[PDB]
Amino acid sequence: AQALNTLVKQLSSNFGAISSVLNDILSRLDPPEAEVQIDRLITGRLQSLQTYVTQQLIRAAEIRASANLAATKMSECVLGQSKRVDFCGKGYHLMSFPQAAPHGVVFLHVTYVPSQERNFTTAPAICHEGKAYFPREGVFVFNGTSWFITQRNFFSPQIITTDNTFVSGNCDVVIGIINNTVY
Amino acid sequence: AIPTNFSISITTEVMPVSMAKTSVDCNMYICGDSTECANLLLQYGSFCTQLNRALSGIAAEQDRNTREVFAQVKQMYKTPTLKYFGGFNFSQILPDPLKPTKRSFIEDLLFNKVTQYGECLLICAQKFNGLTVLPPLLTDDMIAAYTAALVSGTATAGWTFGAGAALQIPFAMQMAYRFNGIGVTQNVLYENQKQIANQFNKAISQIQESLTTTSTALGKLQDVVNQNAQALNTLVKQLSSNFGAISSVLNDILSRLDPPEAEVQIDRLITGRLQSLQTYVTQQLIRAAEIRASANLAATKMSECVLGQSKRVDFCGKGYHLMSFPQAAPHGVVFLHVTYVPSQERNFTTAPAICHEGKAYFPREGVFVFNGTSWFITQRNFFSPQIITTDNTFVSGNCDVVIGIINNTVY
Amino acid sequence: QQFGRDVSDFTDSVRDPKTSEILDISPCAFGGVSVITPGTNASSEVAVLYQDVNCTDVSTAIHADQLTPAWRIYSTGNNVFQTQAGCLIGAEHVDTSYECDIPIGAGICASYHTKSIVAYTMSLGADSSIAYSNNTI
Amino acid sequence: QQFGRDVSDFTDSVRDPKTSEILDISPCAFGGVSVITPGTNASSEVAVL
Ligand SMILES: *[C@@H]1O[C@H](CO)[C@@H](O[C@@H]2O[C@H](CO)[C@@H](O[C@@H]3O[C@H](CO)[C@@H](O)[C@H](O[C@H]4O[C@H](CO)[C@@H](O)[C@H](O)[C@@H]4O)[C@@H]3O)[C@H](O)[C@H]2NC(C)=O)[C@H](O)[C@H]1NC(C)=O
Ligand SMILES: *[C@@H]1O[C@H](CO)[C@@H](O[C@@H]2O[C@H](CO)[C@@H](O[C@@H]3O[C@H](CO)[C@@H](O)[C@H](O)[C@@H]3O)[C@H](O)[C@H]2NC(C)=O)[C@H](O)[C@H]1NC(C)=O
Ligand SMILES: *[C@@H]1O[C@H](CO)[C@@H](O[C@@H]2O[C@H](CO)[C@@H](O[C@@H]3O[C@H](CO)[C@@H](O)[C@H](O)[C@@H]3O)[C@H](O)[C@H]2NC(C)=O)[C@H](O)[C@H]1NC(C)=O
Ligand SMILES: *[C@@H]1O[C@H](CO)[C@@H](O[C@@H]2O[C@H](CO)[C@@H](O)[C@H](O)[C@H]2NC(C)=O)[C@H](O)[C@H]1NC(C)=O
Ligand SMILES: *[C@@H]1O[C@H](CO)[C@@H](O[C@@H]2O[C@H](CO)[C@@H](O)[C@H](O)[C@H]2NC(C)=O)[C@H](O)[C@H]1NC(C)=O
Ligand SMILES: *[C@@H]1O[C@H](CO)[C@@H](O[C@@H]2O[C@H](CO)[C@@H](O)[C@H](O)[C@H]2NC(C)=O)[C@H](O)[C@H]1NC(C)=O
Ligand SMILES: *[C@@H]1O[C@H](CO)[C@@H](O)[C@H](O)[C@H]1NC(C)=O
Ligand SMILES: *[C@@H]1O[C@H](CO)[C@@H](O)[C@H](O)[C@H]1NC(C)=O
Ligand SMILES: *[C@@H]1O[C@H](CO)[C@@H](O)[C@H](O)[C@H]1NC(C)=O
Ligand SMILES: *[C@@H]1O[C@H](CO)[C@@H](O)[C@H](O)[C@H]1NC(C)=O
Ligand SMILES: *[C@@H]1O[C@H](CO)[C@@H](O)[C@H](O)[C@H]1NC(C)=O
Ligand SMILES: *[C@@H]1O[C@H](CO)[C@@H](O)[C@H](O)[C@H]1NC(C)=O
Ligand SMILES: *[C@@H]1O[C@H](CO)[C@@H](O)[C@H](O)[C@H]1NC(C)=O
């Protein structure tokens, strides 16, 4: 809008010519004299006109930044699930609902947010009968009662069995090997 | 060809995210403090209304680019006391509190290889030219504070800091999960945790001596300063253009010549300088659209590369990235790259499946590598002889649907 | 040598034609004006910022009526504080920190607390610490 | 009052100087033309807009 009110308000400028209405330049001045004062009004009205094009032309490429964002952030986020860092909301994105906006779009990203944390004491390795044992996925979790396995988003116990234990290598080499009983 | 022995080194990535915001008063650029210029100026129209809407619209966007890159952090985490994390020497990267700098050892050398218009730096002085360079929103101490809370907090919380609340984790537990990203086992970290840490301690020592000795690795940040210098001086030297007048001096044309000789040549030098002012305003407006690009390569390589770990090839580190280190710098960001570069491969014989019981046996991961002696399963990022068992391989179809099955037994 | 010039091409130093005393010529002070308001629904008071200027000359020229523009009903209230952005005149300096609401520059923001318009240094965020505990998650 | 203006400086409506009726002014017509063609290969008729 304020690009156009730049443009409309430059009609009423005199541009250093005799007047800002052509039926007041042609009226008073005689046609040898008037047509040189019309030329400074035409050139004044063209150089604000071509500048309006260039200000529209740069602000057009400001949107192709944001239109190739929204072409991706719809065709990677609604049409899939985004596995990126704070792309599509903050947290772990699950769905996305795009809406339609005047001269733009509206997204509705739904994220997964972890909560309600609690410490424990950890361990990277178990010494079970001469070997060092390693986690397949998770860490060695000791809540004061027993040693078990959980995942890094939800606290839920897993019995340390050689199903879900990365069995490799000898004991007493790795930093932090804790004498437990793997079942 | 599968490796067994890799390297960790550090690669510097350098980006600018902001340039120097300026502003221009017309009545001392255009008129040069003459009265009749301003009388002639108000007859052109209020065009300096719009020419300080533009250089405010850029100057308000150099605040966002400095703020959208660095101020991703919710909580300013303190610098921890011990800076030695299982052999990982974070001394040169977090700032040393003994200095009166609030800067790390890296950042001090960055300022000393990078190192006309009014400014108020305190001594405030004006110029005859109406060119001012206003100072930014975030001073360099605030910039060196978001840097320090991105390496303090990530040394104690890792990817959780970008995931959610900055949950504690040992940093040796941290790097091992960052081997789990690139398909590389926990035993690659823990067994090798001495010389993993001691290449990385000397890889920082390389970047020290590479930046104490020379420069021009910061060529991008130099050129952001150079394009500031030219566009001001071209705006300076076009003051001295005659533009068809008898001189470029509005007060000689005022005082020395006739009043009919004046207004002819006042009206020349304004229309000359006015559209030389608009060319400057336009070329700042284009140059501030490349910064808005290269401050979004930094607001994604500080989202994706610093908080998470990136699954993107040759993006924030050649090879497989592990961790990223932000730094402050004059007008921009200097990244460091913990990269997984495998090395020293040998030749191995592969084959599609096992022929036992007249049935095909399909692996879940990797290949089947012949030792010269034995068949076993490994992955292609380090040599790892895991033996073919009953659950690391599964079954569908008979033999010889694969071309070149092994007469083997699933053990 | 009669006179001096700067790194630009206007003269800023002169040897005196009468008594040969080597002088400096700095131009007169000038700059932009901002206005910091909290909203007409909020209030009807404002505090103005004068950009890139020394508070010695600005606070002087207000009382001596030397500013173009000049206001009909305005006075400083004796609140002049120098930032690197310029002489913020009309707001109350406060020694605490908060989050930024209306920016000024060089780490200074201003807002509308107990009501009046106040100015302060930014707080970068919540302060915290994380233990580096050798076996804890 | 004798004649009205719009938000620009153009007098978009006047009153009759003789019979005091207030009359709008309308910019009789203008506009662009575009040519909607199937291509000169497949046809030689057009349609203007
Ligand atoms: C805004 O303008 C005001 C005035 O126009 C200005 O305040 C002035 O600051 C200077 C220093 O910046 C002061 O000068 C000092 O005055 C003391 C006491 O009179 C002297 O002892 C000082 O001498 C020391 O410094 C000299 C130069 O650094 C050394 O050569 C010398 O050996 C001494 O170490 C020095 O002369 C001056 O008094 C004030 N004047 C007033 C009226 O306040 C202020 O700095 C300007 N601010 C900005 C941002 O431009
Ligand atoms: C696999 O790669 C690693 C590193 O790329 C190689 O480790 C290097 O081994 C040599 C020994 O051949 C080390 O040299 C020795 O270092 C000790 C340090 O205590 C020093 O006291 C000795 O006098 C000697 O200089 C070298 O330091 C070490 N590299 C690093 C970075 O520490 C390893 O040899 C490679 N393996 C193969 C099979 O190539
Ligand atoms: C972790 O890295 C830091 C580098 O920041 C190591 O600090 C360095 O330690 C050496 C050994 O003391 C210092 O060399 C000595 O410095 C003193 C200080 O004046 C000097 O008198 C001696 O002649 C010698 O040069 C070195 O300067 C120092 N580096 C810095 C920047 O201070 C630190 O030792 C590393 N950690 C471990 C456990 O090694
Ligand atoms: C620590 O976790 C274990 C599970 O891994 C919890 O153990 C169970 O607790 C329930 C309720 O007390 C008992 O009925 C079960 O018999 C326990 N199972 C085992 C194997 O011990 C334990 O309660 C947790 N610790 C605390 C303090 O809640
Ligand atoms: C966990 O078990 C290992 C088993 O190897 C322990 O290592 C033994 O340590 C004792 C003294 O600490 C020695 O007398 C034994 O000879 C070691 N075992 C072997 C097989 O040599 C280890 O000490 C245990 N952890 C802790 C904390 O005691
Ligand atoms: C892996 O195999 C390649 C080719 O199969 C080997 O490269 C050849 O090495 C011989 C010397 O032993 C040369 O004469 C050939 O010209 C090489 N050929 C090519 C294409 O490079 C390579 O040396 C082997 N490497 C290992 C570690 O086994
Ligand atoms: C976790 O431990 C830290 C220090 O070890 C302590 O400050 C914090 O209160 C603990 N939180 C919980 C939920 O146990
Ligand atoms: C593989 O071959 C090497 C040397 O040929 C030998 O030392 C090693 O024991 C073999 N491993 C297996 C699992 O056959
Ligand atoms: C494997 O055994 C089958 C069945 O005897 C035979 O057809 C095939 O040729 C053998 N593979 C090789 C490489 O000889
Ligand atoms: C002024 O602000 C209050 C704040 O709640 C709001 O309720 C009220 O609607 C606002 N006034 C108008 C006219 O909207
Ligand atoms: C961390 O644990 C390892 C092994 O338990 C030990 O060598 C090291 O000294 C410990 N560091 C601290 C700071 O407690
Ligand atoms: C002029 O006179 C006619 C009748 O002769 C009348 O209808 C009209 O209103 C008059 N207009 C003015 C402007 O007096
Ligand atoms: C021209 O039109 C004919 C059919 O009308 C079509 O087969 C041909 O490909 C067209 N060629 C071009 C250059 O348009």
mmCIF file of C-alpha atoms in Angstrom, chain D residues 6 8 12 14-15 18 21-22 24-25 29 32-33 37 41 43-44 46-48:
data_model
loop_
_atom_site.group_PDB
_atom_site.id
_atom_site.type_symbol
_atom_site.label_atom_id
_atom_site.label_comp_id
_atom_site.label_asym_id
_atom_site.label_seq_id
_atom_site.Cartn_x
_atom_site.Cartn_y
_atom_site.Cartn_z
ATOM 1 C CA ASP D 6 -11.335 11.759 -3.719
ATOM 2 C CA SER D 8 -6.161 11.836 -4.607
ATOM 3 C CA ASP D 12 -14.327 13.035 -8.811
ATOM 4 C CA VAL D 14 -19.225 18.139 -8.946
ATOM 5 C CA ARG D 15 -22.504 19.945 -8.396
ATOM 6 C CA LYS D 18 -26.984 25.912 -12.906
ATOM 7 C CA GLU D 21 -27.599 18.677 -8.878
ATOM 8 C CA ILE D 22 -24.503 16.846 -7.659
ATOM 9 C CA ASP D 24 -20.244 12.025 -10.232
ATOM 10 C CA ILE D 25 -17.440 12.002 -12.769
ATOM 11 C CA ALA D 29 -13.103 3.809 -19.893
ATOM 12 C CA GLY D 32 -5.213 -2.839 -21.249
ATOM 13 C CA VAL D 33 -5.731 -5.308 -24.054
ATOM 14 C CA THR D 37 -4.580 -16.945 -29.085
ATOM 15 C CA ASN D 41 0.068 -22.646 -36.113
ATOM 16 C CA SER D 43 -5.456 -21.260 -35.843
ATOM 17 C CA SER D 44 -5.667 -17.703 -37.109
ATOM 18 C CA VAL D 46 -7.830 -14.609 -31.658
ATOM 19 C CA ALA D 47 -9.770 -13.345 -28.680
ATOM 20 C CA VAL D 48 -9.044 -10.021 -27.024
#
